[PDB]
Design a protein around this ligand. Structure first.
Ligand SMILES: COc1cccc(-c2ncc(CN3CCC(O)(CO)CC3)s2)c1
Length: 732
């Protein structure tokens, strides 16, 4: 590709990564593959405040505090060098750095935590040390920690006129700190993945509608002279812009060589935007679990009125209706009273609320959606149209999300001129058509893909379903989407990943695709692998988890050959609480599963304790893959049982191929070492006991690095293959 940047026109650094085609590319044309992890989910909450501890939860945040120092990596006690060494030893060259809006602007509006940004820069320098490519993830989950997840600082809830201490009583949000109640919390009983249902409760339904479409559906909500939409978007964009600016100014050496780009706002909520009927819950809403009130039922609850709501259980094929429970807030209203807005809201944080922003009562009824006197729905399709143009049916992705991404993208490149725009469309949604006025030949599709069944049920079922195919109207009967057996289930999920790749070619353009999140739950079968059930039988047996991860990872192999960042790597993962967030346990490594410099790891002469101890199903996520390829990757296939690894490339006449430009393949010690015994390890070093058969050219192995030289075809294009296998089968 051109030595000049398609964004700037300026010449490119020798470590520039080209993202102008369907694949990442270096300056010498080699097609790059980026595989790593998300680091880390531990940075979603401050120090000494995991999701299940309510003590100190509100008091610190109301004090404007937010101690996120040493999360994800502790730079004080030297633990960071070990974790990074373990990730480089696993063949990973990518990191999705997680940070949240709360950790940057917790003190107050435009009161930024520069000490934490300096910490982030310090961690980013260490990842650069280790040769990791990083792209930043502005992370959030159901808006904020205080609405059940992570992301926004506490004052943003007050910014929308919401009383944070009336959330549980109105069912506007389920929090792990206050489940099933703030009076008698039992966070051990927190249902599986129920936190995600918060997107469909009143708090997230209100805030997200304010965020993306405040000026359209809540024009009466003025704060500091501007609508709540501009107030929340500008503050978040400015906060992320501050971190980008401090990186470019204080440590510009990190841009492009280490920090290659920036992701969009992680998994944004759609609020009530596009709701065709507030009286019902659409059948296309994939996720329903627990008490699931309809929008109007959630609004009536938000006004302190009792409702009898559908209860949903998650069966073997999606949610299904169960109980019908009565939620009785006993008059407690979600909405902040004006007196409390003076003491804790507007007057506490230093903004002025408009005259027509009615407090203490439901803001949507104030816009005529329903009448509080009769509790009768008035405008059921209010969120399906533009009030200013009711003939226009709204689409959340095209009409509102894309507008936000334009504002966000311009601020990123303002401080990171060579930033790659990692575009993360909303969950289970195709990306929109975006102008290349903004993209400028430097972008990557950044969708998330999870085996939804395995994630929601915390089991590796003998069955599975083509969820994407059902969404995209591929089947006359939904039973056609069901697959049974590993073979059919693996081939099916690999076909779902292929549809994510076709969304890039068809909508955005010839840009790479990178699965920003993928993974499997480790606390499967009631934490059986942790010895919690059946008298401890099955402890340390991660066979169920291994096949689940092998499926999702193989789904990115095959003809896809995708880039991805596994979710996640939580350095402080424990069996009792998982990743210390809403009962999820998706981390590859934990201290409870126990029992160094860059060049030393590259030579391969390290203890196998590093690549084995503390890991779970390491055979699944530590896979052989081509780091750089002369040509274009055609197909990747890996089999854990026999360690056989076939790789096919497409080589052309104009591909550059000499002895300093070669195909690089990573062969892990986890599968291909002569032995991983710590006994043998103290006396002898690790080395690849492999058999290589290449259809073309020359090979060479050092440590864990395989090099493959081959001459380009004289005419047209051809396919070269290479096949690696450990001598004698799998390491037993
Ligand atoms: C077959 O089902 C599918 C298919 C494609 C995509 C998805 C999801 N995309 C985002 C999801 C939820 N997110 C929230 C956070 C999470 O808990 C990690 O922290 C898990 C990921 S699912 C599910």
């Amino acid at each position: 590709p051109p030595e000049v940047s398609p964004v700037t026109g300026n010449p490119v650094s020798p470590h520039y990564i080209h993202s102008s085609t369907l694949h990442f590319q270096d300056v010498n044309g080699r097609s790059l593959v980026l595989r790593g992890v998300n680091l880390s989910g531990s940075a979603k909450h401050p120090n000494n405040q995991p999701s299940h501890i309510r003590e100190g939860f509100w008091e610190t945040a109301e004090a404007g505090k937010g101690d996120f120092i040493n999360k994800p990596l502790n730079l004080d006690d030297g633990s960071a060098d070990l974790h990074l060494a373990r990730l480089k030893a696993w063949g990973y060259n990518l990191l999705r750095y997680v940070f949240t809006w709360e950790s940057l602007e917790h003190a107050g509006p435009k009161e930024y935590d520069y000490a934490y940004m300096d910490y982030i820069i310090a961690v980013l320098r260490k990842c650069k040390e280790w040769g990791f490519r990083v792209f930043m993830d502005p992370h959030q989950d159901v808006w904020s920690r205080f609405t059940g997840g992570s992301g926004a600082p506490l004052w943003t809830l007050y910014a929308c006129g919401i009383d944070p201490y009336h959330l549980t009583a109105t069912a506007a949000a389920y929090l792990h700190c206050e489940w099933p109640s703030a009076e008698s919390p039992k966070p051990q009983d927190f249902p599986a993945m129920i936190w995600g249902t918060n997107y469909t409760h009143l708090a997230n339904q209100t805030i997200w509608t304010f965020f993306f479409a405040g000026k359209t559906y809540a024009p009466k909500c003025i704060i500091d002279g501007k609508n709540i939409q501009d107030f929340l978007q500008d503050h978040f964009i400015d906060a992320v812009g501050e971190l980008a600016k401090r990186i470019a100014e204080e440590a510009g050496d990190l841009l492009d060589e280490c920090v290659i780009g920036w992701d969009s706002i992680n998994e944004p909520g759609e609020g009530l935007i596009g709701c065709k009927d507030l009286a019902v819950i659409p059948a296309e809403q994939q996720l329903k679990k627990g008490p699931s009130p309809t929008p109007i039922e959630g609004m009536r609850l938000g006004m302190g009125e009792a409702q009898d709501v559908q209860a949903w259980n998650f069966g073997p094929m999606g949610p299904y209706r169960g109980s019908r429970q009565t939620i009785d807030p006993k008059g407690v209203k979600l909405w902040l009273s004006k007196e409390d807005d003076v003491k804790r809201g507007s007057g506490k944080w230093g903004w002025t609320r408009g005259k027509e922003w009615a407090l203490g009562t439901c803001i949507w009824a104030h816009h005529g959606v329903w009448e509080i006197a009769t509790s009768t729905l008035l405008r059921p399709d209010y969120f399906s149209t533009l009030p200013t143009n009711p003939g226009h049916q709204v689409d959340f992705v095209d009409d509102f999300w894309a507008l936000h991404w334009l504002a966000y993208s311009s601020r990123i490149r303002l401080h990171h001129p060579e930033s790659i725009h990692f575009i993360q469309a909303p969950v289970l949604r195709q990306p929109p058509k975006l102008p290349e006025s903004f993209l400028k030949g430097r972008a990557c599709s950044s969708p998330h893909f999870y085996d939804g069944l395995t994630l929601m049920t915390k089991h590796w079922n003998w069955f599975n379903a083509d969820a994407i195919g059902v969404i995209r109207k591929k089947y006359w009967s939904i039973v056609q989407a069901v697959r049974i057996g590993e073979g059919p289930i693996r081939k099916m999920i690999q076909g779902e990943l292929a549809v994510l790749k076709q969304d890039t070619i068809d909508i955005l353009g010839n840009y790479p695709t990178l699965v920003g999140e993928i993974g499997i739950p480790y606390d499967m079968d009631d934490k059986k692998a942790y010895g919690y059930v059946d008298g401890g039988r099955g402890e340390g047996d991660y066979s169920s988890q291994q096949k689940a991860m092998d499926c999702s990872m193989n789904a990115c192999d095959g003809p896809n050959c995708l880039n991805y960042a596994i979710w996640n790597y939580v350095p402080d993962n424990v069996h009792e609480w998982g990743d210390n967030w809403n009962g999820e346990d998706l981390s590859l490594w934990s201290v409870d599963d126990k029992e160094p410099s860059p060049s030393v790891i590259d030579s391969g002469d390290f203890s196998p304790t590093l690549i084995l101890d503390g890991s779970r199903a390491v055979a699944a996520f530590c896979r052989p893959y081509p780091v750089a390829t002369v040509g274009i990757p055609e197909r990747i296939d890996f089999d854990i049982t026999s360690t056989k690894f076939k790789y096919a490339v497409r080589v052309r006449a104009d591909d550059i191929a000499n002895e300093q430009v070669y195909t690089e393949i990573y062969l892990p010690f986890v599968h291909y070492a002569a032995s991983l015994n710590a006994s043998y390890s103290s006396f002898a070093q690790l080395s690849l006991d492999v058999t290589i058969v290449a259809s073309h050219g020359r090979v060479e192995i050092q440590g864990q690095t395989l090099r493959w030289w081959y001459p380009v075809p004289g005419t047209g294009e051809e396919v070269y293959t290479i096949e690696v296998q450990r001598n004698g089968g799998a390491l037993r």
